[PDB]
Motif scaffolding. Structure first.
Motif, PDB file in Angstrom:
ATOM      1  N   UNK B 120     -39.899 -16.141 -47.142  1.00  8.54           N
ATOM      2  CA  UNK B 120     -39.562 -17.075 -46.044  1.00  8.54           C
ATOM      3  C   UNK B 120     -39.742 -18.495 -46.550  1.00  8.54           C
ATOM      4  N   UNK B 121     -39.380 -18.759 -47.794  1.00  3.70           N
ATOM      5  CA  UNK B 121     -39.439 -20.127 -48.351  1.00  3.70           C
ATOM      6  C   UNK B 121     -38.134 -20.828 -48.107  1.00  3.70           C
ATOM      7  N   UNK B 122     -37.904 -21.994 -48.705  1.00  6.41           N
ATOM      8  CA  UNK B 122     -36.640 -22.738 -48.478  1.00  6.41           C
ATOM      9  C   UNK B 122     -35.502 -22.077 -49.246  1.00  6.41           C
ATOM     10  N   UNK B 123     -34.271 -22.393 -48.889  1.00  6.51           N
ATOM     11  CA  UNK B 123     -33.071 -21.861 -49.568  1.00  6.51           C
ATOM     12  C   UNK B 123     -33.095 -22.272 -51.040  1.00  6.51           C
ATOM     13  N   UNK B 124     -33.568 -23.478 -51.329  1.00  5.33           N
ATOM     14  CA  UNK B 124     -33.689 -24.021 -52.699  1.00  5.33           C
ATOM     15  C   UNK B 124     -35.126 -23.841 -53.144  1.00  5.33           C
ATOM     16  N   UNK B 125     -35.549 -22.610 -53.300  1.00  2.00           N
ATOM     17  CA  UNK B 125     -36.916 -22.286 -53.759  1.00  2.00           C
ATOM     18  C   UNK B 125     -36.801 -21.008 -54.569  1.00  2.00           C
ATOM     19  N   UNK B 157     -36.803 -14.814 -56.159  1.00  2.00           N
ATOM     20  CA  UNK B 157     -36.623 -15.487 -54.847  1.00  2.00           C
ATOM     21  C   UNK B 157     -35.215 -16.029 -54.707  1.00  2.00           C
ATOM     22  N   UNK B 158     -34.735 -16.761 -55.710  1.00  2.00           N
ATOM     23  CA  UNK B 158     -33.424 -17.426 -55.671  1.00  2.00           C
ATOM     24  C   UNK B 158     -32.309 -16.448 -55.386  1.00  2.00           C
ATOM     25  N   UNK B 191     -38.356 -33.025 -52.387  1.00  2.00           N
ATOM     26  CA  UNK B 191     -38.236 -33.055 -50.905  1.00  2.00           C
ATOM     27  C   UNK B 191     -38.098 -31.614 -50.389  1.00  2.00           C
ATOM     28  N   UNK B 192     -38.790 -30.664 -51.000  1.00  2.20           N
ATOM     29  CA  UNK B 192     -38.796 -29.253 -50.560  1.00  2.20           C
ATOM     30  C   UNK B 192     -40.234 -28.776 -50.534  1.00  2.20           C
ATOM     31  N   UNK B 193     -40.716 -28.133 -49.447  1.00  2.00           N
ATOM     32  CA  UNK B 193     -42.099 -27.656 -49.416  1.00  2.00           C
ATOM     33  C   UNK B 193     -42.395 -26.693 -50.582  1.00  2.00           C
TER      34      UNK B 193
END
Lengths: 217, 218, 206, 217, 218, 206, 34
Positions: B120-125, B157-158, B191-193
């Protein structure tokens, strides 16, 4: 092993649903008692039934009656079933004991336990353990009146105070069980009888460990 | 058969006996059964419904946070992230699952379990974790390469957002271990958690069975 | 994509049967998903009891029977992360918590606005959120999908019932993995609930 | 639901038709009692039977006998049925107890209740609850002698005063019921046993309200 | 079957049990059954026989006057004439009907009712009344036009002397309302009584049912 | 028009069987219906026990069996209003009322004249007049019809019975809606009862 | 209030252009778009 994990077998076997006491000595000289039929008398049985939302079943009731010291004399007993929406006895010798439409069982303590099967009694197509609504205040919320299965008024057939207390153990066996809409097993302690109310001190569903990487408890 | 003998077992009330008894209201017609959707006839069908493992069942964690496996940028690589036992009947993360709750109504169980992992991370993670299963005999792996030599899945993940691990077989009459390893560092753009969560889900397979009904501990 | 609740399409009863004045999409007030958000639930058909032509029918008809199609749309950038569980709970009876053992009318029937959870861990009903996946549900993983569609048929012990007094089911949107972002991103993520009643039937017109 | 609203089911189930007492202590040392069979013993059962004009049925009688304090010792009892137009016992040891044509049931208090089915006994084709005529004074009007089903003389089989009172509850179940010419349900209170006599203070069939336009009571 | 076991339920006397018992007079021949006319086998057949509602069950009214709904020349038009509830089991006008008396021997009932209205004025007595039925949800109408917008029948005295209203459906586990409105003034020629009566009759339809036998309150 | 009691024509028993000396119409003394009238009842065959050839047969024969055809004619102008219920009550046992718990012979067998009701609300039998419509009946609404015809077969638990001692049924004419008129109209309305025995059988001739 | 009448819900992320057809309007008091 698929028969043991079926709804029919999960809800099978006869369980204690109430210890009814017919007190007739000391101060309590009533000589009768009325016990309302509650499938969720105990929290163990309540949690198993609340696994589903709707059920339809027939119940078989057995009465294991004896005296204080396990003695079973020749005393006569009347186990009258008061259907849902019939008046209940208000005394040892009220006229409700003679009503023909209330079925009675006449049995002695010396006889093997009496058994009788109550059918599916609800005006709806299934018993409803969860009713998200009001019958027509805050108290009436969740209170479906269609789950009432009746009463079991029990007395000694006597003209005066016998002076002997009779302990009646009611055993019920759910039969021909059909369940709908499975629900999560209750995790919080039950506070009251007819409400899902839980304590503000929320209990964790899982037991705690030192850290997420240590397999020790 | 007029001449009869009463054999031992008369006038006994066996609570598990399945007999007949007279209807108390003969000729009473129950409400007819309409169609209600969602009839279930088997606890095994509920056992194989995926429900959230409480893998973060750690002292001091409360509420929905106990359902989340935290993933974050690591100073050291090949560190262990999380570990839980494959043991539905025992105290631990499986307590919060439907299979783990039904298992407490039975004495013995057998069959395979699957554990789904949801990132459940960001799309770019992007990044890799190693999910390794240890059979009941062997002890927990100490290092990422030790876990890599056994049964494992390398999860990216990617590419793939959910991975499913099937536990081959486990029984109750000492148990399997699942460990999640940081294969690579957690990689993010600006700028990504830099910290995310994994939600672990668990259920039974089609070969799961239960035996000897018993009353639950709660 | 679409998930059928309990694998059954909603259908007619073998009474008022509106064609398009009721079957239209109803779009509710958008919810702001924030970091500290616990979740929201709506009761059906209480959410539509005072909303448009369906609201007029549900208030001036004695009996009611309808299926629903829920769309839970989410507007987030690729730089937002989080997971919502969208679960439909049939007969969602809300529980009170006491250190007040009976929930207020505002909590049992929140209306079209909807109510926030206070204890989303126990779903405000004493049942674990971890096992809420026995109910019909969809995940919204902000990195995978931003839509959930649950088709819910009519579930009741009775063929018909009162819209105003009884809620057949509740719909809960619960952030499992909290919303998280970096400074500069929108501090909230809109969550839009769109409801479409299917096979609606009414009786007792006045 | 058409089986529950049938004449067969309306008149089904066993009901108390009389509490017979066999007194043998204090002053009453008779040791026997004769109870005339009355299907209309109680006003509840009388009103249900008077819904029709003619009935034909077989009756099944059950005797629930016990002592004052519900005790059921090994005491022997004789339940002799005296058919319509046979002489009745006039004492504890009269010769009528030995008459073969009066069927007897010998049963103990320790045994389960005795049951026996009396057939349709009337000289006419059906029992007649209303007879608009005279058998051949004002007293004899409405008095059909063809409705007499017999007597149940009950005694303890003993040579002297036992000193124990036996309470007998007679339960009757109407069987194979056929009814003719339905009649309005009685609205007035029953004053006497065999006459439709009612009080001059006529009771209204319907409960009263303030006015013909207000739906409040 | 010589070897037997006595199961729980022996030596019990269940008053609703339908067993056999020995004939007390075996070989006694009952009087043969001649043909008697008027055999009834169902209380439902009696339930659908029309009987008079006691609509004027008002304090101070006695005897046959309680069965009559008075109709007279009105100074004001669109006034309410009479109102009663559609509730056979409840206290009120249905107490005097056969369906309302049988309903007190049962716990629950369902089905449709019809209410017949009979006008007993002079042959030369014309006018219109409005008979309106209110479903159980809604409250009693306050005005004649309010009642006119719901289910209603406009009844003309001059043309049709008896009108039948069918109540769609009503059940017992808050009830329907029937209101009679003065649509027009009571019109008479000279030397004709200016006040008349309506007799209200009531019964059940073919879809009426009864359930769960019970003893009546009277 | 004609109403068959219990949907069965009267017929012969599969004994004296008169052809036309008994089958003729018997017309009774006319009753004056007034405003304050409570009603009238007759007992059958007590009404014909001392009337013509049927009267001679019923008094000199041990057993009796007959059906009846009753015509209740009413002579009213279009300016008279009122409703009579004409009901046949099988085994009409009259009750006494006490503040005299046994009715007089004049009340149980009024003869050809007939008896007036004292409490027509309870039919002088403790049974409501409102439910008297379970018995075979006809309405006479003065604005609709002035005739009632009820055909009553033989109803008895016995194939034969005594005419003099037993009354099979009673016939009651009861004004439900009272007679009302304006000044100048006839203050009373004649009510004529015409009886025709059908399929009469007799036994024990002397 | 506008949601209960004729409306289109337009999502920026998905669909970049939306077309609304006005059913009918004449000149011999006029439609509104909000």
């Amino acid at each position: 092993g698929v028969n043991e994990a079926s709804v029919e077998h999960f809800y099978s076997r006869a369980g204690l649903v109430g210890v009814v006491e017919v007190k007739d000595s000391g101060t309590s000289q009533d000589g009768y008692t009325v016990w309302p039929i509650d499938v969720m008398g105990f929290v163990q049985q309540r949690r198993k039934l609340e696994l589903s939302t709707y059920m339809r079943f027939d119940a078989e009731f057995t009465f294991v009656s004896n005296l204080n010291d396990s003695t079973t004399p020749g005393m006569l007993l009347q186990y009258m079933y008061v259907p849902p929406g019939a008046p209940k006895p208000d005394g040892r010798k009220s006229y409700q004991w003679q009503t023909a439409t209330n079925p009675s069982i006449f049995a002695k303590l010396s006889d093997p336990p009496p058994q009788v099967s109550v059918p599916f009694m609800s005006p709806a197509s299934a018993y409803q353990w969860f009713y998200d609504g009001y019958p027509t205040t805050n108290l009436q919320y969740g209170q479906c009146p269609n789950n009432m299965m009746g009463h079991f008024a029990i007395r000694t057939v006597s003209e005066s105070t016998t002076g002997k207390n009779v302990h009646v153990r009611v055993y019920m066996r759910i039969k021909h069980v059909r369940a709908w809409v499975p629900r999560p097993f209750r995790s919080q302690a039950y506070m009251v009888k007819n409400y899902p109310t839980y304590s503000q001190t929320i209990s964790n569903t899982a037991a705690d460990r030192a850290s997420i990487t240590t397999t020790d408890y | 058969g007029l001449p009869t003998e009463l054999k031992p077992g008369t006038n006994q009330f066996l609570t598990t006996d399945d007999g007949t008894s007279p209807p108390i209201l003969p000729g009473f017609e129950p409400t007819p059964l309409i169609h209600i959707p969602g009839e279930f006839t088997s606890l095994l069908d509920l056992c194989r419904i995926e429900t959230i493992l409480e893998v973060n069942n750690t002292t001091g964690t409360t509420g929905v946070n106990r359902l989340l496996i935290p993933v974050r940028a690591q100073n050291n690589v090949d560190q262990l992230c999380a570990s839980f036992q494959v043991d539905p009947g025992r105290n631990g993360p499986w307590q919060s699952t439907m299979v783990g709750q039904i298992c407490r109504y039975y004495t013995q169980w057998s069959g395979s379990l699957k554990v789904t992992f949801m990132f459940t991370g960001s799309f770019m993670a992007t990044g890799k974790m190693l999910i390794a299963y240890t059979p009941p005999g062997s002890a927990q792996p100490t290092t990422r390469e030790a876990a890599m030599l056994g049964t494992h899945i390398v999860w990216d993940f990617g590419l793939q957002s959910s991975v499913t691990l099937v536990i081959p077989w486990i029984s109750n009459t000492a148990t399997g271990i699942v460990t999640i390893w940081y294969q690579t560092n957690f990689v993010v753009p600006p700028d990504t958690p830099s910290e995310a969560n994994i939600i672990a889900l668990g259920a039974a397979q089609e070969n799961f069975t239960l035996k000897l009904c018993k009353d639950t501990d709660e | 994509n679409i998930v059928l609740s309990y694998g059954e399409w909603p259908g007619y009863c073998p009474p008022t049967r509106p064609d398009v004045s009721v079957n239209r999409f109803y779009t509710l007030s958008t919810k702001s998903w924030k970091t500290e958000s616990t979740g929201w639930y709506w009761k059906f058909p209480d959410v539509l009891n005072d909303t448009g032509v369906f609201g007029q029918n549900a208030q001036f008809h004695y009996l009611y029977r309808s299926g629903f199609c829920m769309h839970v749309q989410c507007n987030a950038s690729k730089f937002h992360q989080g997971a919502l569980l969208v679960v439909v709970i049939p007969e969602f009876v809300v529980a009170a918590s006491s250190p007040g053992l009976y929930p207020d009318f505002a909590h049992t029937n929140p209306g079209k606005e909807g109510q926030v959870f206070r204890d989303p861990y126990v779903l405000d009903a004493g049942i674990p959120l971890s096992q809420a996946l026995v109910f019909p549900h969809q995940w919204i993983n902000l990195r995978t999908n931003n839509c959930a569609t649950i088709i819910m048929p009519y579930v009741n012990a009775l063929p018909f019932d009162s819209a105003l007094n009884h809620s057949n089911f509740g719909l809960a949107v619960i952030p499992i993995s909290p919303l998280k972002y970096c400074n500069g991103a929108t501090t909230e993520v809109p969550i839009t609930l769109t409801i479409a009643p299917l096979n609606s039937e009414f009786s007792g017109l006045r």
